[PDB]
Amino acid sequence: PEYQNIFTTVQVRAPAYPGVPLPKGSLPRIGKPIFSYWAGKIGDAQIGPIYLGFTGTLSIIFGFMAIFIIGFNMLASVDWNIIQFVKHFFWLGLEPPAPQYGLTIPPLSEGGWWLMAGFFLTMSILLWWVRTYKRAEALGMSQHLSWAFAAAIFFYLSLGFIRPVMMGSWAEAVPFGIFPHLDWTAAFSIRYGNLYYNPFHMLSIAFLYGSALLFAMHGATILAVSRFGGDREIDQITDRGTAAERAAIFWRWTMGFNASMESIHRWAWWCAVLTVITAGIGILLTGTVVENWYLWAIKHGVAPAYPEVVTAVDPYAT
Amino acid sequence: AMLSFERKYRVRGGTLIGGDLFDFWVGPFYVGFFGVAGFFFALLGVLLIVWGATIGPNAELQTYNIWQISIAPPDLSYGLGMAPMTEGGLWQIITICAIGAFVSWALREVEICRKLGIGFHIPFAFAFAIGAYLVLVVVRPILMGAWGHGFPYGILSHLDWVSNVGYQFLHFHYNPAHMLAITFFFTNCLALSMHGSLILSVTNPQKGEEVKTSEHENTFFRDIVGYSIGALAIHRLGLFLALSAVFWSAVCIVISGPFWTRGWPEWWNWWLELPLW
Amino acid sequence: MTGLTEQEAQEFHGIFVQSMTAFFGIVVIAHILAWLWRPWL
Amino acid sequence: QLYKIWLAFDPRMALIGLGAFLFALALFIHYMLLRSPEFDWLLGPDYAPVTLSAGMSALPAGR
Amino acid sequence: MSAAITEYMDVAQLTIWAFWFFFAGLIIYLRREDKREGYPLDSDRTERSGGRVKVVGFPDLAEPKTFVLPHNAGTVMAPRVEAPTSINATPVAPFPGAPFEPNGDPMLSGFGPSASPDRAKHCDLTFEGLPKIVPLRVATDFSIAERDPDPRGMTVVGLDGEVAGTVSDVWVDRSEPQIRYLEVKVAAGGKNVLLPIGFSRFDKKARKVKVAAIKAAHFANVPTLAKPDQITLYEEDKVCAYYAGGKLYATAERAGPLL
Amino acid sequence: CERPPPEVVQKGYRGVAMEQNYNPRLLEASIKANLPVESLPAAAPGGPSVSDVYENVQVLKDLSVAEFTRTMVAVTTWVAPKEGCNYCHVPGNWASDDIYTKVVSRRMFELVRATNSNWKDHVAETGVTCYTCHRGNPVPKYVWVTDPGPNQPSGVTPTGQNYASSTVAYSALPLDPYTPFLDQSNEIRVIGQTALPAGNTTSLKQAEWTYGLMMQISDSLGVNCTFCHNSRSFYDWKQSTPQRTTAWYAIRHVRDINQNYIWPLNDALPASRKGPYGDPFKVGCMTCHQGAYKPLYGAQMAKDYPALYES
Amino acid sequence: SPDLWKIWLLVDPRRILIAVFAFLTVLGLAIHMILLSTAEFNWLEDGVPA
Amino acid sequence: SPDLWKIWLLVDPRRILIAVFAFLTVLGLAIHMILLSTAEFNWLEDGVPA
């Protein structure tokens, strides 16, 4: 077939690019850059260098402390048996404080470690946000990434901090574990009457689905016009080439309207950002202003009614 | 009406079927053979859905509420045969129209790709979404042995179907392909936000600055995560993540009931029963 | 084209049958003993 | 004079195309027999279904 | 405060309605951003009105934004007024929405898949101001990876299998190191022409570069470069568009239909 | 990895996906592992009465001697076929209560008679038999004790969860739902029954405990959640199935069995019939059901034995 | 050994110091946390002194 | 063997050192953790000395 531009057939090697010079007074980039042949098959071969500044160092230190605390408690939960740690690893977790503790600090194994892991992880994520902001600022770039990251952080904070504080219970928060936080996700929906009927959950899914739809659309579009240099989107934004024109014309002929080479990235940015924005809102509304989402849907005429082919006598109505 | 640069691209030919018979545009749309077929596949399917909403599950429950409209598949007792129109047959007809419309849309995209001389990545990518729909309404119902296993056509009713199918395996989060598909969905959304941010931040930089370069783009994510995939490869990755998410989602649902009937957490007992522990 | 001549194919397929028929022979006796052990039809 | 198929179809694609189709069709038909309990040979030659007595039902009540 | 706004209205219902108003504004904003290119539309509505009715749809166009180019390459306005460009084609029928048939040799018409806009007659530049797409003979620090074959010396083969030429040099992107063009020494004439990597399918075993877009004879008409060691953005579009025209024009059956 | 198609039982409206999926071969093996015992031939009518002949009969007083002997032969096959009558009797002395198995089995007769006579909201004319739990074993195979979970460091309070357990069908949910719900009577409902908050302070953690119990219930009956629920509204009885009503009574029936019949027998029972906490081997779901929607797939054995019903 | 000074010709002291200090810190945290997780050696909850 | 010094001509001396030091530390940590997991060999929870 024609070259689909999925894999780089013949790779080119040049001296490792140190990166665009940073403003005077900044720390140097660390790591001697290396080239990976298999990374260069699908993408760029160069690995490194990385900028590890003051903010990134604090984020790493805070982040390791949170991760070490979680993994230590997982190991303690299997009574230090490293073999049983591996067997049950997906099922292990650092679990939030018990319901009777409210918002108070409980003993270490009764939620105290979870609070420390939650705080340290939150600090590292917040410090990582400052790092993304600083890296864009140091390059003279706009702060689109840090805004989008802040939106994801808003959802993350809603899950583990803001909602538990609004409910006055750390027991509402997410366990630090693979299957445990899936159990939390299911139990959250079950507890509050079928999160499918949370309209912001509906919106979050529409944007999550749209993110995959848009990136599939945009990813396929750019690859389809990469024979014209469509991958070089800065060129196509400042100097519209035939790649941008054919990309826009394809979609206009397909669905009657189209974006531009720049505006497609605004559609992409907002679709992904709104996924976590509406996710955060839906979480914050649940249990605070809505107790049962299905019953809220019934009140607002959202839930469909089915013919009664099966029913149960209510034993509490005796 | 065309874009100000579009007229030089409105060329004759490149059709798969039809030649010059339907080779024309209606407003912005290219029609072609599969535009005619697809439009009247969609038009019939949409009208039948409206008709399905007009009679409802029954006259008492019939509603035009857009959230509550639901065209339901047949009862499982009808097997893989055809059901009466008011007992799931309308759903079967709409499903056929939907397949006709979706495939015609993909084939119309192929003809547009031929006209423009571009790669066929978009129709190929769209085939994955069509394949996922085909798995849900054709492949899985056939493997289970009844058309009633398909999801109902209703904005909220098909969520009740998803909910109940998930709880047919007592904890659907433990489905391994489901976990893989979600990971791809979540990573794709993260990659999309990153790619949207980087392009926007480079072409719309701080005030008083010129448009940045591809060197800035590589440097930015090298400065953050120590690696930059590249301007071309991020689109490979985005396509790969989105397509893998749908492929694994199709796998996760087609193994849920045809190739696995137990609760999904129990599937992990192969790992728990390894003699190492 | 697969980068070999007419002469090479004669001897490659000449004993390819030999490796095939020996592998089939082990397969057949394996099924015969399996049948003579417990029939499956 | 039936060679003409090989002047319009490459020997290599057809042979690989034929093999993939024939293997897929054979797998499909073998599966269909396994689908039918009458032709499910994996149950054994002397397969006897479990006898149900005293009001037993294999399946719960349906709809 | 409480969750119930009225007997029926509640906070969640208010929140979802608030999103719909924001989302409506966001869609209006995004559509306006979409319309910074290609608007007002080329329409018969404008043509019969003598230009008195500009076709923009809804929402209308945004005020022009400013792109300041690096290295004093200039300033472009995203919504810009563009002079009409004549098309080397004629309508195949007189009804609206009818397609056009290219005039003359379709591969040379500059219409349809072979059409391209006139980009700036300046080379794309690296961050240091050097031309970005250059041959390997001027980007001396660049090299082909050891595990991959060197394209130089490979036989270039057209869509029909006939030999079109040989690969003299490889043009690389000096910003993101990768191949973008293959300089082909045309067997017929000998004049070097560029071949985009997107139209080149490598056969590593046979040391052949297969170009399905165009025949071997079509290589003689590939647009040539002004300077031998660099390519402008305008020339890049001209070269890529020419090969793309072959996907529809090179062979008569490529026009379709299949059946 | 299983081979399609499964045997599907639709229980709800079309398109609601309230269905039970059964692997035909897995179902076949389960049925073969849950076959009933053929009833004994009916005893000869008339004859001497139990009260006239036997001294220490406190439960089966209303029986004829022929029916009483038939019952002892039946329970021997049902409970101790490999041990005979001497498992529950002092050798030579039929009326002696000097062995714990006789004290327990007398109480077990009351358990069965009460179940078959007063818990028909659950056992519904099918009833139970000593075979239903014991299946020819003196110790029923599927019993439960209060689970301490995995061993923990002495200074670590157990979470009771986040550990792969078959009790919750190999999820990480709270692995001991028997103790709060099938022995104690902790509230199972967690879902608020109003659209807007109205005082339901139930924690999300309590939902995980209910989820754990329902995982055990579904595994015990070999069914999924839609056997009793429309998952779009777990709370709603109107959208539930009749089996949810039966399961509601079964929970109370199990609580009565454990609190009023098994727990008072703890002192008679030896240490081997007790868990780490000291509680006796207790009855849950899967003690009778053993992975089937009805014990022995609805086989009707109790109706042939008049000794298994209250007078 | 009298020549145990020669390892530093093989490994960078900067790297070896960062790794050692990081490892010793985590090990110190882990042992302290094991003792806090042990009721017989948790010096904060043992109630001593009363 | 008298020529057992010949291994390091093929394997780099630095990379083997990093390998053994890390492997032994992990092995030592794992064995200690496994012993702590046992009631018989947990020296912190056995109550000896009283």
Ligand code: BCL
């Ligand atoms: C139900 C009753 C019987 C039974 C009834 C039948 C009947 C009836 C038939 C078979 C046939 C077959 N059965 Mg049976 N079979 C049963 C149980 C089995 C079991 C088992 C362990 O249970 C096995 C392993 C088989 C296996 C087989 C195969 C030997 C054979 C299918 C041929 C084939 O696939 O060619 C397709 C695959 C090919 C590769 C064909 C090759 C030809 C092409 C031109 C080669 C091209 C090569 C090229 C490189 C392409 C390669 C492929 C691609 C790269 C993918 N049966 C049961 C017990 N079985 C069929 C047969 O005899 O065929 C000869 C047949 O008619």
Ligand code: BCL
């Ligand atoms: C459980 C019983 C006791 C207890 C029993 C012990 C025992 C036993 C030990 C400790 C040790 C420590 N305990 Mg204690 N400890 C207890 C309770 C506490 C509490 C508390 C809040 O209750 C705290 C904060 C501590 C804290 C500490 C640390 C001071 C120390 C671990 C340091 C380390 O890991 O370095 C690792 C990190 C590094 C970076 C190592 C690097 C080495 C240094 C920092 C670098 C060299 C410095 C300088 C250059 C030297 C120059 C030399 C010449 C001058 C040139 N313990 C309880 C009450 N504790 C350990 C100790 O004393 O080690 C010093 C130790 O062996």
Ligand SMILES: CC[C@H]1c2cc3[nH]c4c(c3C)C(=O)[C@H](C(=O)OC)c4c3nc(cc4[nH]c(cc(n2)[C@@H]1C)c(C(C)=O)c4C)[C@@H](C)[C@@H]3CCC(=O)OC/C=C(\C)CCC[C@H](C)CCC[C@H](C)CCCC(C)C
């Ligand atoms: C638009 C919404 C989507 C989104 C967006 C998003 N995420 C983001 C961003 C954005 C815009 C970032 O800018 C930020 C980023 O950096 O991306 C590359 C990020 C990010 N999203 C991430 C993850 C993530 N995002 C998710 C989701 C999403 N992100 C949404 C779908 C999820 C999911 C689905 O669960 C995950 C898991 C990270 C990769 C990154 C934020 C990184 C961060 O905060 O790091 C904190 C650091 C730690 C907790 C660990 C530090 C400790 C080390 C492990 C110690 C040991 C090793 C050590 C580093 C060795 C070297 C030491 C040196 C001293 C030598």
Ligand SMILES: CC[C@H]1c2cc3[nH]c4c(c3C)C(=O)[C@H](C(=O)OC)c4c3nc(cc4[nH]c(cc(n2)[C@@H]1C)c(C(C)=O)c4C)[C@@H](C)[C@@H]3CCC(=O)OC/C=C(\C)CCC[C@H](C)CCC[C@H](C)CCCC(C)C
């Ligand atoms: C595979 C990766 C992702 C993807 C990719 C993708 N989608 C695509 C494409 C691609 C590459 C297109 O090229 C094509 C397109 O042109 O998009 C603008 C498309 C498209 N993806 C669309 C939607 C869509 N994609 C989805 C998903 C995804 N698309 C994946 C996540 C979803 C989800 C997750 O729900 C939706 C809703 C359309 C906007 C468009 C295809 C338009 C089309 O086929 O038009 C013809 C049909 C009609 C106009 C109407 C047909 C009506 C029927 C006859 C009756 C109704 C039947 C239906 C089953 C009713 C069900 C209703 C209930 C579920 C509420």
Ligand SMILES: CC(C)=CCC/C(C)=C/CC/C(C)=C/CC/C(C)=C/CC/C(C)=C/CC/C(C)=C\CC/C(C)=C/CC/C(C)=C/CC1=C(C)C(=O)c2ccccc2C1=O
């Ligand atoms: C004779 C006669 C009258 C016949 C009838 C008329 C006929 C046959 C018409 C044929 C067409 C048909 C069948 C129409 C009927 C069905 C209708 C009305 C379809 C409308 C089209 C449609 C399905 C629209 C849905 C669009 C929706 C809701 C979502 C799509 C996803 C989405 C949010 C896209 C917005 C972002 C955009 C525009 C992406 C496209 C896009 C991408 C992805 C780029 O990467 C890119 C790169 C560089 C430049 C431009 C672009 C670009 O435009």
Ligand SMILES: COC(C)(C)C/C=C/C(C)=C/C=C/C(C)=C/C=C/C(C)=C/C=C\C=C(C)\C=C\C=C(C)\C=C\C=C(C)\C=C\CC(C)(C)OC
């Ligand atoms: C190298 O590392 C070693 C080997 C040493 C240890 C590694 C161990 C491992 C392998 C650990 C693995 C951990 C895993 C797999 C964790 C998985 C975690 C998951 C999936 C988490 C998912 C979601 C969790 C969320 C959303 C939690 C959010 C919590 C928040 C936001 C809590 C914030 C809490 C705060 C701010 C506390 C506030 C209270 C203040 C006052 C501090 O309290 C005193």
Ligand code: HEM
């Ligand atoms: C009338 C019929 C029954 C008889 C004769 C009977 C007899 C006994 C005996 C003798 C024991 C003690 C066995 C031992 O400890 O070695 C026992 C224990 C037990 N039985 Fe039954 N039983 C009967 C019915 C049931 C039923 C219907 C159930 C289930 C609801 C049940 C559940 C148990 C349990 C849980 C124990 C404790 C485990 C044990 O100690 O063995 N039994 N039974």
Ligand code: HEM
């Ligand atoms: C794994 C699938 C299941 C899930 C997720 C599930 C979920 C739940 C939930 C959340 C509740 C609490 C309802 C409320 O808060 O008002 C509940 C109660 C109940 N479930 Fe289930 N359930 C499952 C399986 C079953 C099955 C198979 C049955 C029938 C055998 C059953 C019978 C009941 C009954 C009777 C109640 C009410 C108990 C009471 O009020 O005391 N459930 N279930």
Ligand SMILES: CCCCCCCCCCCCO[C@@H]1O[C@H](CO)[C@@H](O[C@H]2O[C@H](CO)[C@@H](O)[C@H](O)[C@H]2O)[C@H](O)[C@H]1O
């Ligand atoms: C539906 C999506 C697109 C797929 C296209 C194919 C659709 C279905 C193929 C048509 C098959 C029709 O096959 C026909 O089905 C009906 C309905 O089950 C069968 O009818 C049979 O079962 C139904 C219910 O199961 C009974 O009410 C009826 O008494 C019995 O005869 C016919 O015996 C069979 O001849």
Ligand SMILES: [Ca+2]
């Ligand atoms: Ca103390």
Ligand SMILES: [Ca+2]
């Ligand atoms: Ca000790």
Ligand SMILES: [Fe+3]
């Ligand atoms: Fe892009």
Ligand SMILES: [Mg+2]
């Ligand atoms: Mg938990």
